[PDB]
Amino acid sequence: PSQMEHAMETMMFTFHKFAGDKGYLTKEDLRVLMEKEFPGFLENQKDPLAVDKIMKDLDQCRDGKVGFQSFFSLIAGLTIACNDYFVVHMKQENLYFQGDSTVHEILSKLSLE
Template sequence: MLSQMEHALETMMFMFHKFARDKGCLTKEDLRLFMEELPGFLENQRDPLAVDKIMKNLDQCRDGKVGYRGFLSLIAGLGIACNDCFVVHMKEKGKK
């Protein structure tokens, strides 16, 4: 049986491969489809070019592809943003 951390890591790996399919990388369209798994994030984005900007930041080689390392950078950034919101929420909740 997997620990919670092992399950989380496995889930991230499977999500990458689900969208990368047999290419081993994500294209901008793959990234857009992946971001649809995060509807709350996209709803809060006021920038219609958010996926384009994310792709540009992750595509280090400028070849239109994002590998697993880039994908993990995206996940890390999203995790940091979520944690920041959580901390603010908990501080506001504590003030009430």
Template sequence: MPSQMENTMETMMSTFHRFEGDKGYIIKEELKVLMEKEFSGFLENQKDPLAVEKIMKDLDQCQGSKVDFQSFFSLIAGFNITCNDYFVVHMK
């Protein structure tokens, strides 16, 4: 039986591949939809209402309008770091 971490890894991979549609990358518009569907709680709790647009702009400067799995994973890692930082400061 897979561990919780293995299930998490599988979920991240399958989510990316569901949106990329065999292209090997997600375009800006697909990533915006993915974020709004998969990170709605995270985004709702942002103090900045333009958080998604800023993330897209940062990605656009680095990658053009394409986000590959490595960049997607880095984005997820950044979200995890942000959430952990908040937890360490406010929840303990």
């Protein structure tokens, strides 16, 4: 019941739920993953090619297949950006944000460079 160990399980099993037996994500699998796990995120991007662009910028991603470390670099990029946002706008600032999820809220403030 460590929260960190729980969070790791979520990330590992989320990848495998969407990658299935083949053990990697297609562009379409990633799109479906993001649509469910980052609801509103892609749609908020003003770009029908956002997923294509994201893939291009993932780590160890070259032949249409997103492996786990690649997937993890997506999570890293989003989480690090959310944290920068949080540190600048929410942490010291002071807060009184009353949303159910601060990461959901911050994700609605991000776009790909």
